[PDB]
Symmetry: D4
Subunit: 158 residues, 8 copies
């Protein structure tokens, strides 16, 4: 468990790395009041313990022409492995960044990104709705990004 | 504008953000000094907005990830207040104004359904701007990446 | 059907709340002697009025923290209805099951330890059952009220 | 912390709640005295909330089991007044604050539809904090038990 | 031909279907002789489709009056089979094809909720054509009349 | 709250279908003695069973081509419910009004000449009424069945 | 009123597809001399059948590449209906607008450059209008068919 | 591809409202000599900018007094989409059809003379089509606004 593996300073480590993910061990060492050796040791425990799963470069969709962030609610037909064949193909679609099996009226909620609405129609008509397992889709689109952080809260571990 | 090599840099760094300039230069088929100019251009051009360490919710005890469908009152100071308030809720990671049935969509994280209940009943719904909420929960993470698609730039 | 009296109702009304009372105690509550009281309580059991006595447990005390109310709708065949009802009775994590009016056709009441527990039940058991066409599940955030006790003032 | 015979006792009593100590002990591979202690602890520990006689709705003329979905208007203490009122309504057996479209969900019992109409129109819908109500009725009780699952502790 | 007096007739008979031609001829200001010519021509032109005795549903023990919204499976004949089956169900008084979410709306009467369940569960839902159903019940008759409006004809 | 003789039901069954029948013609459709057939109505109508005898007309024949079913929800202000009731009673075009269970609070069954007639009613009368929060109107495309006759075999 | 024959419906039908045709051409297609064709056409305008001659453009060709249908709900004020009507009429991007039956009270058809533009309109114009309670917007993914042409063969 | 200028748009804006103008009448309005203006317009037609000149009619003048906005759901079988598309294109009472985002997959604009006409269509042609799973129809009570004119100022 994290209270019997992650002490106060490790939590600050993940807090800083979550936000400035490309620091060097020494930059981080300066950031958490620690000698470069044990700091490195700690950041290695966390990476091997599964806590830090990935370091990534986050981009601006608008800058790379992606104007239309769509949240699509999908329902899967009662077929053999409709679930798994949908799941298999959703991982192959680069435009679809995330997919989740949700509670409620919808079975699946997908988070996608596209350039313009024409782009989106060809994907919805020719890929999503054309897929044997996909029974019905409902697409909504983002009008304003009020908030967007990859950072999880860690004060519950304290 | 940016060329096929600038698109290879971004594709690569989206997956391994911490990747070294030697390694990066190698995969993008460029020398160390010149390719490190592109990456600095790109960072200085805003294309790359942040470098982040992505964590595993299970590992840090956030075993409950929710999507909450919220709607604000027909008010002037309801819009900004809810926004200003969601920005200060660390449990709440993203928030969006959607088209369609619901006006706002929140994506947040919790430990247990108990943690959630206190948040929804004592923070969210008691916010003067919030008119109604409707929260669903993630049963199975089929796919989740922070990597944007870049083939359209080719 | 058994013809009930004022004392007969008081007995039920006592038993529903404290169902482990000794007959000596139940007799003194409802203002009766053991012998008569015992014959009543037995007549009330005989009649089918009392269907069972039950020890009621605290869900959180036994690690079930997540209480799901699940709206199910079953496939349209002259078999899915009985198969689903048959399976529902074999599922111990589901306590109640009701065929309802309105949008949802079936309503289930189920208890689980965590949300991950639910995910296995819904994905691997409920929604893979040939009869189940769709599910919509909610969760209890706060128990405002929960009694097992039926009202009996309409009999007086 | 509950062992194998602590759990089985709970299993036995959840079904046959009025057993003698002697016939309870016979059903758990335990002698009277030990079994009486293991039960005492379970009660003092909060595990056994109460012992209740379960009756038949049909038996006592209650032929209409309604599951009602009500929402509450946004006003100071509307939820507390609803809660406190629903606790003094004997026809209402249980009431839960829920995730999803509905704010609340009651399970009520009535002699017939006329009885229901009077409750809904002149007590539920007339309470100040009650904004809306959607009632549905049970057509067939496929399963009903009070007995919680306990095989997760084994 | 539907001049004022022909409407004064229709209006009166809708309310008092049983009225004597003497009394009818009096309320519409006509000698009996032509009042009986006019009415017969209304009876034989189709206008008056039926004279009917309207009964109190509670009086004959049918307390439960339902409104069911039914959708037929989209195949061949199903539409006709559900139609013809609905015509042989005496508890179903009216059945309309409506616009909107639901495809058919049924008005039906029952003795009690138990009588309703048998019907929904063993007839309505078990009919090969019926895809699904959604039943709502009448808590109070605010108004009910068989009299059409006819002012527009004036 | 009772049950009547086998042919006493027929009296109601016959009258519901042919309501302006002569007691002579009635006594011939129920196998009842001539004048004692008038005696039996003298017990039914003279009780509460028969509420009214009415002339049922053809909507199309009197120009009423459009029959709407309107789902109306009511504002929760002080006695807004009786206000609505008080007004639906006065609107001739609205034939029947019921307080339903489910999503919508009230259901109205109305008749109109054409859609323009419905617009004026909906905009200028229904939705402009102080108690009416929302309305949701659906129209009939085809009358599969319509009888004013109740089932009476539950009484045998 | 006018009495339209097969020649006159042919006039309107040709004009509906080809609005700009020369009077000589029009008369050639519709089997009439220029002299009366001209009269008959002007009779259809003066009558009110021809309400407007218009050139219809391709949205994409004018960068308006985002067509939205918007379902709007007016709050219950007294003037809310007319205020919204008035403001709707001044909004050029909103081309048509309808009081519909059903769940939605108003249906709008609008054209925008792209979602950014759409966001500005909903957040800063539509939802900030005092009489507007709610907005549920959808977009066109594929234009299967779109004509201004009405069917007129029911008049024959 | 052609670039549009301040004058070019005026030609667009004027034509959109007054479609049947003569070339002389258009020239003396956009600040262009008759000869240039002639060509420029033909290049806009040829460029796809102006897609069709139409005479627009009054529904109520030609007895089409029921405007239905229909929401259809297509059966997701083997290319049922193309079939519905191909037959929607033949149905004259249907002027427009769109693949929408959100609850419904399709949205139709239809025009009828009355409810009888609508019934005949929805029951015996639309819902009897093999690709059509569900249909949900509404009707306009009031046209607040209707223009064919697109906005063009975003090009200035
Ligand atoms: C494959 S995810 C299933 C979700 C489930 N039916 C629910 O909404 O509760
Ligand atoms: C005919 S395409 C239908 C698209 C679907 N309604 C959506 O929301 O994505
Ligand atoms: C907070 S912005 C809400 C937008 C609205 N849901 C729409 O569909 O237009
Ligand atoms: C009375 S608590 C209401 C909870 C809220 N409707 C939700 O979905 O989270
Ligand atoms: C049985 S006719 C069905 C009509 C369809 N529900 C509509 O609204 O258009
Ligand atoms: C399995 S019984 C289903 C009944 C149906 N949902 C109704 O509303 O009447
Ligand atoms: C106008 S009474 C409304 C009753 C409410 N719709 C219910 O379902 O209980
Ligand atoms: C602004 S008119 C609203 C009409 C309403 N939606 C109905 O169905 O009757
Ligand atoms: Ca909404
Ligand atoms: Ca809890
Ligand atoms: Ca999990
Ligand atoms: Ca809600
Ligand atoms: Ca009743
Ligand atoms: Ca409601
Ligand atoms: Ca487009
Ligand atoms: Ca944007
Ligand atoms: Ca009209």
């Amino acid at each position: 468990m994290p209270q019997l593996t992650l002490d106060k300073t490790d939590i600050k480590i993940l807090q800083v790395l979550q936000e400035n993910g490309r620091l060097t061990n020494v930059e981080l060492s300066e950031r958490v009041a620690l000698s470069p050796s044990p700091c490195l040791r700690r950041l290695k425990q966390l990476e091997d313990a599964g806590i830090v799963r990935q370091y990534a470069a986050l981009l601006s969709p608008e800058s790379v022409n992606l104007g239309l962030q769509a949240f699509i609610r999908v329902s899967i037909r009662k077929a053999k492995d409709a679930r798994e064949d949908f799941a298999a193909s959703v991982r192959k679609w680069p435009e679809v960044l995330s997919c989740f099996a949700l509670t409620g009226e919808t079975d699946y909620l997908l988070q996608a990104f596209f350039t313009d609405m024409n782009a989106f129609s060809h994907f919805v008509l020719d890929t999503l709705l054309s897929h044997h397992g996909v029974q019905d889709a409902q697409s909504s689109f983002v009008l304003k990004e009020i908030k967007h952080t990859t950072s999880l809260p860690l004060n519950h571990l304290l």
